[PDB]
Every structure is written in structure tokens, then in C-alpha cells.
């Protein structure tokens with residue numbers, strides 16, 4: 001067992017277990033009881049003060065999902081990402097977490113992986129366990145199993161060099177440009193080739209991502225037949241804002257059509273001066289601002305806005321206004337869509353920069369904490385904080 | 401005996417080397433009596449000079465009491481007991497319930513050998529020149545940090561077998577109390593209750609006889625548990641002529657406790673007596689409405705009302721009513737209006753809000769509660785219509801979701817008193833506000849506000865606008881602030897200004913709010 005340690009000075013996590021629905025609890029009991037017989041985990045005593053939260057997600061089979069976020073933050077770094085993978089036509093995601101369930105975990109870190117299956121109405125102490133093997137979701141697992149992994153793949157890698165294979169946590173991203181049919185046949189070869197070694201389900205409905213088609217949802221201005229005082233005021237409003245990004249944006253001419261207190265509905269004819277300025281503004285906006293590069297040493301942030309009707313707007317940036325990417329997502333219910341979005345956006349961040357972003361979610365914590373695991377399917381969990389979307393930021397990111 | 405839990409002192413720290421206070425020869429002679437006995441029983445063992453550690457003992461007939469604060473400051477933390485207690489409504493009905501008191505349980509459980517040394521105390525010798533006896537615990541010291549966790553943990557492995565053998569009986573552990581329950585014919589229950597006691601004996605734990613036992617009703621933490629039903633302990637409202645800020649705060653306190661089983665208890669009037677109060681002893685004459693409130697509560701309370709147990713087989717239904725503004729009363733039941741529990745909800749999140757929004761939170765509070773108590777989320781019956789919700793739903797920037805719910809035409813029905821026009825109204829005068837405004841039809845009014853704050857002047861302008869405008873108005877402001885607040889479509893606010901606007905707004909035919917830099 002490769003001896004691991006927590007960063008210097010840091011103690012183990014002591015995270016509260018959020019209440020679970022009897023269904024989830026039962027699923028967790030069946031699962032942990034089996035992992036126990038298989039010796040992957042073991043019951044623990046009161047002398048272990050630590051706790052990591054667990055969840056049951058959803059085949060008809062349930063998947064246990066430990067929220068090792070806190071533990072991974074206190075877990076020593078270990079001493080790469082193919083910018084090419086993001087270009088491939090199709091990317092498939094395989095869940096290879098089981099590859100870990102066959103590598104003992106350093107006898108001394110074990111206490112740190114403690115987790116608790118809760119009890120309804122606190123009628124029992126809760127079943128406490130800790131891992132004996134590399135736990136899925138832990139930051140250490142991919143690293144420690146890296147070696148054994150590189151072996152297993154060196155063959156296929158060389159046999160199908162036209163194939164890009166990126167591992168991230170419990171996920172493996174198989175990328176290529178082959179036609180859809182050969183891609184799926186090629187993937188399956190990998191499955192039985194990962195099986196040849198040891199215990200691989202598909203992720204995302206066994207369906208594939210087409211990163212090649214992903215694209216920046218740029219800013220747009222209302223293009224309309226007649227322009228009223230309101231349209232203009234909104235137009236200037238949106239423009240002036242975006243000016244803090246594209247400073248070549250000018251409002252002087254449009255702001256002249258708005259001299260004197262007029263009636264909101266009054267239709268104003270655009271002076272040629274104004275006509276051409278709007279034109280220049282549309283062009284500058286035609287593309288993302290130059291000089292925005294991804295710093296590998298800063299946190300990646302993702303904010304999502306609810307646009308109503310099943311549409312959400314998001315942006316990925318490390319420095320305010322300096323978006324590395326911006327998009328849209330459309331259908332359910334607010335929460336389900338919201339989590340689907342979060343997972344879509346992560347998957348890309350990973351595929352693109354192989355790092356998960358920190359979300360700012362427009363939802364009440366208790367709510368999110370209550371329904372996210374009903375629609376969640378990834379094997380990872382991003383960092384997320386809860387916010388209050390400003391009324392205008394949504395207005396400046398809507399549609400077509 | 402039961403396997404032992406390995407303990408350790410906190411990292412770096414070393415055992416308790418604390419001095420033994422002088423001890424009266426009369427106490428010294430009574431301790432030697434007590435300790436010698438403990439030794440004769442295996443709990444402690446005379447030790448020598450080797451062990452430098454020591455932890456203060458003193459006498460409280462005569463009983464022993466060891467001070468473990470220092471060791472407790474030096475002992476590792478443990479996965480603590482639970483702090484989360486069951487809630488009666490979560491319990492299932494049972495035919496018989498026997499509660500056994502595990503007398504000296506911490507004493508019939510072993511202590512990690514490698515740790516025993518740290519529990520070292522000393523009984524001073526009576527005469528000057530001669531040294532006294534030095535011991536250390538072989539078992540769980542009562543008063544020690546890890547005794548409850550290690551006692552319980554062990555009590556659980558002990559009970560596990562028996563548990564898996566007797567599935568028709570359920571067991572709840574709570575401190576030294578062991579509550580055994582089942583739907584067995586009393587006779588078999590009393591025999592089972594007696595095998596249990598014999599299985600615990602086969603493991604050192606000693607329980608009381610059927611003659612010293614305890615059965616329903618149980619008076620557990622402000623509750624009254626009967627085998628088929630529960631409730632809160634008897635609660636009596638004083639009949640004073642003079643109520644102090646302190647008497648009132650406690651009344652308001654007990655009145656809230658009742659909220660969980662007695663529907664409709666109200667504390668508004670009372671709580672309002674606490675305003676501006678200057679001391680915990682200040683007397684406050686009861687207002688006319690408070691006396692009315694106190695009288696009502698007094699009545700509600702005179703009626704004994706019980707809650708029934710959880711029927712895992714039946715569904716959970718939560719029903720919510722608006723008891724007033726900001727107030728909501730709900731009740732969870734499985735069988736037609738036959739409560740398991742009930743409750744209130746005043747919680748106002750944010751300075752402003754609307755019943756739609758507020759009702760939706762009530763739903764979330766209630767949903768989280770249910771998951772904690774019964775492990776599932778109830779089917780809700782709400783005084784709101786799908787289209788009204790769905791309307792405030794998709795138009796709100798924040799994401800939100802209500803479980804499975806059905807409308808219940810039970811007044812008052814939560815509604816939306818107004819909704820801003822999505823597009824500037826044609827033919828409606830247009831106001832540009834900033835403390836004043838100017839309109840497209842030449843009107844204007846300046847007002848000098850006193851004491852106001854920047855943002856408060858913003859809402860004022862708007863208010864001023866709504867005021868002089870006719871049924872249809874268009875307003876343009878720069879206040880992103882006033883904008884957000886009003887765009888959130890509130891109907892109630894702590895602010896009076898905001899409330900006047902809300903009234904203006906409700907009265908208008910059409911209102912269009914617009915922002916500009």
C-alpha cells in the first residue's frame with residue numbers, strides 16, 4: 001500500500017451526513033453490506049471521529065456515491081491533460097471506479113475514509129464504515145492506481161493510437177473522430193479489454209459527447225423592425241454593460257435618440273449616426289473578447305442563470321468578465337434541469353481543462369440539498385455555492 | 401467479555417498528572433472502602449510508582465466522584481453519541497413497551513489496556529509519613545469523555561445478534577435506558593423482555609427486575625408517550641395579574657412547544673409585549689388582544705390532544721393553511737385529518753416576499769422535517785392553484801420545485817395581488833423618477849425627504865410616481881435596487897414604504913417598471 005498522508009497539519013474531515021430518504025438508506029445498506037463481505041470496507045468503532053457524506057444515486061441498480069470533497073482538499077497532492085481530446089469528434093465516458101476496489105489502501109489512512117449510513121428518526125446509531133481499499137471518488141485513488149492503469153492501456157493505446165484516452169477520477173474519456181458506428185464498436189472493444197484485466201458501465205446513457213460541436217454563445221442585441229424609446233433604453237442598457245468587456249462599444253449616438261423625457265412606447269427613428277454605431281457594436285460583439293487565456297493556477301468559476309421556459313445561461317471564467325466559455329442549456333422541473341446543467345458544464349470543463357469548476361447556483365440550499373441526488377448521475381461532485389442572480393445579468397444573456 | 405475499543409490521547413499531549421487535593425481522614429477512610437471493593441470486583445487495580453499520572457478524586461452515606469476534566473481535555477474525540485433524538489410522530493404504534501435501566505453499564509464494560517494507566521488516581525494515606533494507595537480503571541470510568549460512545553457502541557454489538565434473532569421486537573438505546581417494544585401478546589412480550597435481560601447478563605450487563613421496570617406512559621423530554629399515542633406533557637398557563645418580560649418570554653416559549661400537537665396556538669399578541677422592554681423583570685400590562693390570545697390558547701390547551709404513531713404502511717399527507725400574514729399552519733397525517741404531528745411556520749426569508757414564495761418555503765421546511773422523521777416526503781395539499789404557482793414559478797430568477805401536490809380550495813387561497821406589465825403600456829403616462837420625478841406629459845414633483853437613506857429615497861421616488869399616476873403607469877428608474885425588489889413581486893415587507901408601493905401596485909390596472917443607467 002502506497003503510504004498517503006493528509007496535507008501537513010490538516011486533520012481528517014468531520015462532515016455532517018445530510019438526511020436520506022428511507023429508499024436511499026436501504027439501497028446503501030444493501031450495497032455496503034456486500035462491499036463488507038467482499039472486504040472492501042469494514043465496520044468501525046467510536047474511536048473514529050471522522051465522517052464523509054454518502055448518497056445513493058441511480059439500470060435498476062443503485063450506485064453509492066461518497067462526497068469525498070472535503071477529504072480530497074486535505075489530501076496531499078501527488079508527486080496530464082490532452083488539449084487534443086477536446087477536438088476529437090466523439091468522446092465517450094466510462095465509469096472505471098471498480099478498478100480501484102482491488103488495491104488496498106494504506107492501513108493508516110483508512111480511518112479518514114469513514115462514512116455513516118444514517119437512520120430514520122434517529123432510532124439507531126447509524127452504521128459506520130471505513131475503506132480498506134482505494135475508495136471511488138477519493139483524490140488518491142486515480143494516482144495510486146495510475147501505474148497499474150498505464151500498463152492495462154499501453155496496448156490498446158498503441159493498437160488504436162487514433163484514440164485519445166483521458167482518465168479523470170472514476171471516469172475515463174475515450175475520444176475519436178471515427179464514424180458513429182465504429183466509435184461504439186471501438187468503445188466496446190475497450191470494455192472487454194478493461195475486463196480482460198479486472199473489475200465498466202457507460203456513462204451519460206452510454207451516449208457520446210461531441211465536443212467538436214460545442215460553441216460560445218456570444219452576446220446579442222435585439223434586432224427589430226421599429227425601435228421604441230424602451231427598446232433603445234434597454235439596448236443602451238445592455239450595450240453600456242457589455243462595454244466593460246468590449247471597450248470599443250459606443251452608445252453616444254443611441255443615447256442621443258434618448259434626449260428629453262419621452263414616452264416609452266414612442267417609436268424613435270434611428271439617425272444614420274446611430275444606425276451605424278449599433279452596427280459597429282453588433283460586430284465587436286460577434287466574437288469573444290481577445291486576451292482571455294486559461295490560467296491553470298486559478299479556480300474555474302461557473303455561474304448559471306435561470307431564463308425560464310426550461311432555458312439556462314452559464315459562463316465559465318477565472319476572472320470576472322473574462323469568460324473562457326459561455327453557453328445555454330434547455331430541457332422535468334427547475335431542480336432536475338439545474339443539476340443536468342451542472343453535470344453538462346462539468347463534463348466540459350473536465351474534457352477541456354481536466355478540472356471541475358466551482359458553481360454559483362441560483363437555488364435555496366435546503367432545496368438543492370433535498371433533490372440534487374434524485375437526478376444526479378456523475379461519479380464526481382463539483383464545489384458549489386448558492387447565490388442570488390441579479391435581475392439584469394439574466395436580461396443581458398437570454399436568447400436569439 | 402466484549403472486545404475492547406482502543407483509545408488514545410490527543411496528538412502530542414500527555415496523560416493527566418494532576419495533584420490530589422488534601423482529603424479529610426473521614427473521607428480518606430470512606431474512599432478506601434469504596435476503592436477496595438472496586439478492586440475486589442476488577443474495575444480498578446492497584447499500581448505503582450511507575451505511573452506518574454493522577455486524576456483528582458473526592459467524596460460526595462458516602463459516594464465516589466472522580467474529576468476527569470483534564471483527562472477529558474487530553475482524550476481523543478469520539479464519534480459522539482447522537483444529539484439527534486427520535487420524534488414521537490416517527491415512532492410506530494406498539495402493543496407493549498418495556499424500558500430497562502442498565503444500572504452501572506459503564507462499569508460492566510472493559511477499558512482499553514493501553515489507556516488504563518491514564519485513568520490513574522490516588523487515595524491519600526491517613527498519616528503523614530506513610531504513602532497511600534494508587535489505582536487505575538480497568539473499565540469505563542463514569543465521567544470520562546469516551547465512556548458513552550464506547551458504552552453505546554459496545555451495547556450495540558451485544559444487542560445485534562439478539563436483534564437479528566427477534567425481528568418482531570424493536571430496540572432503542574438512549575443513555576442507560578433500553579427501550580424494548582413489540583406487538584406481542586403481553587405474555588410473550590414479558591417473556592421476551594426476560595430473555596433479553598438474560599442475553600445482556602450473558603455479557604455482564606445487569607438490568608432491573610420486572611418489578612422495578614418501567615412502562616407507559618413515559619414522560620420523556622417534554623412528552624407523554626403511550627403505547628398507541630403520544631403528546632406533549634401537561635402545560636398550564638398562569639393566571640397572573642402582573643406579567644414580567646421574563647414570565648411572557650417563557651409563556652411564548654411553552655406556547656411554541658405546543659405548536660407541534662395543538663393546532664392554532666398563537667403567540668403574535670404576546671410576543672409583541674416584548675417590544676422595547678428594558679429588563680427581564682419589567683412588568684408589561686396585557687394588551688386587549690394579548691388577553692384574547694392568552695384566553696384562546698388557554699382553551700386550546702384545556703382540551704387534551706394526542707398524536708398517533710407512524711403507520712409505515714400508510715401515506716403521509718401534509719396540509720398547509722395561512723394562519724395570518726407570514727403565518728402558516730400545517731399538519732401531517734396518514735389517516736383523514738388524524739394527525740401524527742402538526743406545526744407552524746413564521747420564517748420570513750428576505751426583507752420582502754410573497755405568499756407564493758413563502759408557501760413554497762413552508763413546503764421545503766415541511767419536506768426536510770418529514771425526511772428526518774419518517775424517511776419520506778408527504779403528498780401535499782396546498783391552498784394554491786397549479787397555474788398560479790406555475791405562473792410565479794417560471795417567472796422567478798431562482799430555481800425552485802415543489803414535490804407532489806394537490807390544490808385544496810381551503811381559504812384563504814394564496815394568490816398574486818398584481819403582476820408588472822411585460823411591455824411598456826401604450827397611452828399610459830410615463831414617469832422618470834430619481835427625491836422626485838418628471839413625466840412625458842410635463843408633470844413633476846420634488847420632495848425633500850428627512851432621515852432617509854440612499855436606497856430609501858429610491859423607493860420613495862417610485863412611490864411618489866405611483867401616487868400621482870393614474871390606473872396605468874410606466875415608470876423608469878435607475879435604482880437597480882428598487883427594481884429588483886419590485887420585480888420580485890412582493891406583497892408583504894418589513895418596510896412600510898415598500899408596503900405602500902405594494903398597495904399602489906395592487907390598485908393599478910397596469911404597471912410597467914423599467915430600468916436605465
Ligand SMILES: CCCc1c([S@](=O)C2CCCCC2)c2cc(Cl)ccc2[nH]c1=O
Pocket residue numbers: 486490491492493494497570571572574579580581616617618620625626627628629709
Ligand atoms: C423502542 C422503539 C421506539 C418506540 C418507542 S420507545 O419506547 C421511545 C423511543 C424514544 C425515547 C423514549 C421511548 C415507543 C414507546 C411508546 Cl410508549 C409507544 C410507542 C413506541 N414506538 C416506537 O417505535
